[PDB]
Amino acid sequence: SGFRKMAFPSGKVEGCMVQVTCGTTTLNGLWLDDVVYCPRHVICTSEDMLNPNYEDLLIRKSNHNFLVQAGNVQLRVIGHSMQNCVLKLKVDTANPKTPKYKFVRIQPGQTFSVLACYNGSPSGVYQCAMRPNFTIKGSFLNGSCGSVGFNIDYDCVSFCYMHHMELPTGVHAGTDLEGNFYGPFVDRQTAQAAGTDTTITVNVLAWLYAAVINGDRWFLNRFTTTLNDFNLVAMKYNYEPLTQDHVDILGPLSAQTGIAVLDMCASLKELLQNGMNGRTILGSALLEDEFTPFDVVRQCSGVT
Amino acid sequence: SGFRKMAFPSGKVEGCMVQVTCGTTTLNGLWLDDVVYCPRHVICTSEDMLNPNYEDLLIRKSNHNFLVQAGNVQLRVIGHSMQNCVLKLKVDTANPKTPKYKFVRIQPGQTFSVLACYNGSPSGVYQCAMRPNFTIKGSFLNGSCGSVGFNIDYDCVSFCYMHHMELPTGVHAGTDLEGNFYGPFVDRQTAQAAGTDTTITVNVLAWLYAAVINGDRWFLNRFTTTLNDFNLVAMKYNYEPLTQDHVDILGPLSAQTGIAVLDMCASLKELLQNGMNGRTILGSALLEDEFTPFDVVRQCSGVTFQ
Ligand SMILES: *C(=N)c1ncn(-c2ncnc3nc(SC)sc23)n1
Ligand SMILES: *C(=N)c1ncn(-c2ncnc3nc(SC)sc23)n1
Ligand code: NA
């Protein structure tokens, strides 16, 4: 029993984290085979960052300007290039600890594990979701840039996030490993903000199913609803629309508990309209939307 | 900025997890140098569990009755002994991935990382606290016994918890790595139940300090309190007493934020009296008691967002 926000075991990723220094900036890089990936903003000073011409800044640097440290050992950079907003530093040594991996771009609503690192050294691991507004609610201090997010899908690590910056509201923005930002953000000092966010409906439903599986049932009721009427309510409470795809994706959880999706939707309607009346669900007083259906299934089955 | 329940990186522990089988029972073990530690109940049948005589069950086993699998490789058991409620299986091979480590027995209120494992293979990692009633609020299915809890301060792993069982309320009980149970629990199917739990006051305070460090002051007030009046009130909400040790331990968080401990105590009093009135603190609508002072200092900036 029990239900906890749970990260993937981080060991396969820990063996890929390195320190990258350029001038007076130190941040983290990801060392896979003979390439180290890191945010291209590592080459910028404060002044550069106001209006950077990355092409022009990079051509002025030599290989030997990039100091890359894997634990105690220096790696030698033998090439550098840019792909979108990430820098690729070719090094002389292949990482002997490179796991089987892929670069994937995730969708809003999907969760992943973050390995927070400072000076190329892993510090902590937690679970995040890509918010509808394409930010993440992370925990990152200065020096954390280049930390990555990942899922593990067999023995294969799927890297999906590299950290680039913090927005004024204290939430976080970054790229996929091909260097494309999640969201309408840029790696320069200009005014940028998180857009208004919404709640990830399908995930709240998943969590309601988790709660039932774990014996927390007080919010169930005799009523059912339709997709259209439910989505009228969702819109009103700043919830993402529920689609037929979401209903399909919730099928396994529905079958296991005997609660049809639209039956659970009637519970959620009531919670949104009436609140919780001083009660909690899985120890929370708010509705939790950072567990996916697959997250719930994985934790309430035991896959390893 | 931000604030999250954050576990230690699990890789140093992942390289120590193995599968142990005895008869039809499979669970997890912890492979350090040439010893595999696991719960002694691996030798029991379900019938045995009502009144097991572990000494008598164990004397009937040979080395070769214990099957230990490290990933793909079988290890050879060459010795066994029981210490308290753990079995130590001596094996032929030293773990080449053994980290620097020690065993520590923790106190109620201390937090640690759990690596939940099934069939000797890691499944996930999360943060837990030793509750005042000596249970943990974990996430564990059948097959999870032998999963361990740890901290990693510097490069040294401190093992503090091995999982043994689930209590009827759905909370979890286990031992230190010397095989002593936390709490009055036994590895026996009896009527045993977790005592009524309380909130870990010092940790709630720590978290209030975290919220200040991160730029939130709405819950502060102009009042102060004596330690004794605070404790008189707190006990009426099922909060653990705050001791002078706890006040000492909160000193650095007090210095960084400019808010005296007993002034933060007054804020908590008011929060308990009033609740939150639709507001959140660090994204929670409840008061959070699973972050220690040390946890807050580790995660938060040393510069308060004033
Ligand atoms: C990542 N290691 C990092 N530390 C500090 N910063 C940072 N500080 C100030 N401005 C700023 N702008 C960025 S992109 C628009 S990243 C950054 N990053
Ligand atoms: C740990 N690997 C595990 N799986 C299943 N059980 C278990 N099941 C039923 N009863 C029971 N009692 C125990 S100690 C009193 S452990 C256990 N454990
Ligand atoms: Na219903």
Residues of B taking part in catalysis: 41, 145
- Chain B residues with beta carbon closer than 8 angstroms to that of A2: 137-140, 170-172
Question: What CA–CA distance (Å, rounded) separates A244 from B238?
Answer: 46
Q: How far is CA A304 from CA A40, A129, A138, A183, B176, in A?
A: 35, 21, 25, 32, 24
Dig out the tokens for A167 from the structure.
């927005």
Give break positions in chain B: residue before each, C–N beyond 2.5 Å. Answer: none
Per the listing, tokens 């031992």 go with B175
Q: Are the CB atoms for B177 and B59 separated by under 8 Å?
A: no
Contact (CB<8Å) A116/B6: yes
Contacts made by residues B161-166, CB under 8 angstroms, sequence distance 24+: B161/B106, B161/B112, B161/B114, B161/B128, B161/B130, B161/B136, B162/B30, B162/B37, B162/B38, B162/B39, B162/B86, B163/B39, B163/B114, B163/B138, B164/B39, B164/B41, B164/B85, B165/B41, B166/A1, B166/B140
Identify the bridge partners of residue A157 per DSSP, sorted by sequence position. Answer: A101, A152
∠ CA(A7), CA(A13), CA(A19), 5° rounding? 125
Residue with the nearest Cα to atom 6 of ligand 1? A142
**Cα A262 to ligand 3 centre (Å):** 8
Cα distance between residue A74 and residue A97, in whole Å: 16
| Distance, CA of A109 to CA of A201 (rounded, Å) | 9
CA A265 to ligand 3 centroid distance, Å: 7
Can you tell me whether residue B65 is helix, strand or coil?
helix
State the DSSP code for A32.
Answer: E
Q: Breaks in chain A follow which residues, C to N over 2.5 Å?
A: none
Tokens 């299915």 -> residue: B141
Strands across the sheet containing B77-83: B73-75, B66-70, B17-22, B25-32, B35-39, B86-91, B77-83
Measured distance CA(B191)–CA(B171) in Å, rounded: 15
- Tell me which residues of A are annotated as active site: 41, 145
For B157, the 3-state DSSP assignment is strand
Residue B19 backbone dihedrals phi, psi, to 5 degrees: -100, 135
At B161, give phi and psi (nearest 5°): -145, 135
| Residue whose pair of structure tokens reads 């909060």 in the numeric block | B239
Residue nearest atom 5 of ligand 2, based on CA coordinates: B142
C-alpha distances out from residue A114 to A49, A106, A295, Å: 26, 14, 15
Indicate if the alpha-carbon torsion angle B139, B143, B145, B148 is positive or negative: negative
Nearest partner of B304 among B237, B246, B220, B243, judged by Cα: B220
- If you measure from the C-alpha of residue B180 to the centroid of ligand 2, how many angstroms do you get, rounded to a whole number? 17
Interchain contact, A10 vs B10, CB within 8 Å: yes
Q: How far is A81 from chain B (nearest CA, A)?
A: 30
Q: What one-character DSSP code corresponds to residue B178?
A: T
Contact of A36 with B151, CB cutoff 8 Å: no
Query: Which residue minimizes the CA distance to atom 1 of ligand 1?
Result: A145
Give bridge partners of residue A148 from the DSSP assignment: A115, A162
Domain ranges of chain A: 1-14+100-197, 15-99, 198-301
CB atoms within 10 A of CB A300: 18
Phi and psi angles of residue B185, each rounded to the nearest 5 degrees, phi first: -85, 155
Residue B21 β-bridge partners: B26, B67
At B164, list the tokens. 């043994």
Both tokens of residue B98? 């053994």
Residue in B193, B271, B201 with CA at minimum distance from that of residue B235: B201
Asked: is B1-14+100-197 a CATH 2.60.40.420 domain? The reply is no
**Cβ of A8 and B214 within 8 Å?**
no
Residue linked to tokens 């102060």: B224
Q: Is A257 in contact with A206 (CB distance < 8 Å)?
A: no
- CATH fold label, A15-99: Thrombin, subunit H (2.40.10)
| Closest listed ligand to the CA of A261 | 3
Contacts of A44 (CB under 8 A, 6+ apart): A25, A52, A57
Q: Name the residue of chain A whose CA is nearest to B303's CA.
A: A141
Contact state of B2 with A304 under an 8 Å Cβ cutoff: no
Which amino acids bring their CB within 6 angstroms of ligand 1?
A 27, 41, 49, 142-145, 164-165, 187-189
Contact B176, B164 (CB under 8 A): no
Whose CA is closest to B241, among B231, B253, B249, B233? B231
List the structure tokens of B223.
């009042």
Task: Say what angle helices A227-236 and A261-274 make with each other, to 10 degrees.
Answer: 30
Contact status, residue B266 vs residue B225, Cβ threshold 8 Å: yes
**Residue whose C-alpha is closest to residue A10's, from A103, A106, A111, A113:** A113
Say which ligand is closest to the CA of A52.
1
How many Cβ atoms sit within 10 Å of the Cβ of residue A224? Answer: 14
Strands (E) across chain A are located at: 17-22, 25-32, 35-39, 66-70, 73-75, 77-83, 86-91, 101-103, 111-118, 121-129, 148-152, 157-166, 172-175
Name the closest-CA residue to atom 8, ligand 1. Answer: A142
* Structural method: X-ray
The answer to whether A3 and A299 have CB atoms below 8 angstroms apart is: yes
Identify which of A117, A95, A113, A97 has the alpha carbon closest to the alpha carbon of residue A27.
A117
Residues with CB under 6 A from ligand 2: B 27, 41, 49, 142-145, 164-165, 187-189
| CB-based burial label for B16 (10 Å; 0-12, 13-18, 19+) | buried
* Closest approach of A90 to chain B, Cα-based (Å): 26
CATH node for B198-301? 1.10.1840.10
Instruction: Enter the tokens of residue B57.
Output: 């069950």
Nearest to A9 among B10, B140, B172 (CB): B10
**Equal fold, A15-99 vs A198-301:** no
Closest-CA distance of chain A to residue B55, Å = 30
Question: How many other C-beta atoms are found inside a 10 Å radius of the C-beta of residue A16?
Answer: 24
Which of B44, B117, B145, B190 has most ligand 2 atoms within 8 Å of its beta carbon, as the pocket-test mutant? B145
The amino acid at residue A56 is: D
Resolution in A: 1.7
Cβ–Cβ below 8 Å for A10 and B9 = yes
What gap in Å lies between CA B249 and CA B101, rounded to an integer? 25
Q: How much distance in Å is there from the Cα of A44 to the middle of ligand 1?
A: 10
